[PDB]
UniProtKB/TrEMBL annotation:
It comes from Cronobacter turicensis (strain DSM 18703 / CCUG 55852 / LMG 23827 / z3032). The gene is gmr. The chain holds residues 136 to 244 of 684 of the full protein. This is cyclic-guanylate-specific phosphodiesterase. It comes from the Bacteria. Residues 1-65 form the PAS domain.
Amino acid sequence: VVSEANSVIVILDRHGNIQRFNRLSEEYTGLKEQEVIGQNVFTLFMSPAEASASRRNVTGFFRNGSSYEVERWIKTRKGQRLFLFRNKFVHEIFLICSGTDIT
Ligand SMILES: CCCCCCCCCCCC(=O)O
């Protein structure tokens, strides 16, 4: 393998359903992209409190959002890890979430 990425890159629709899920996301979670496409990111990867906040953010973003950053605790194969997500529309029906593990 020539190189590796440094970010967890997840693309979502307005419902939080997953459209793409990169290799580092697979490494953190133990789940393959093919296993998670169409699945809901909030219920799959967040505690109830984080999911509720995150779902409201995404729904609000699709209404009138500008690109933004947020910190989210995420359930991984070694417990919860904190990520900075840089979120923006595709250059709109999909949201690109560009995450760094900031734990
Ligand atoms: C480790 C990969 C799995 C986590 C992907 C989560 C997507 C984050 C969406 C955050 C939106 C928000 O809370 O404002």
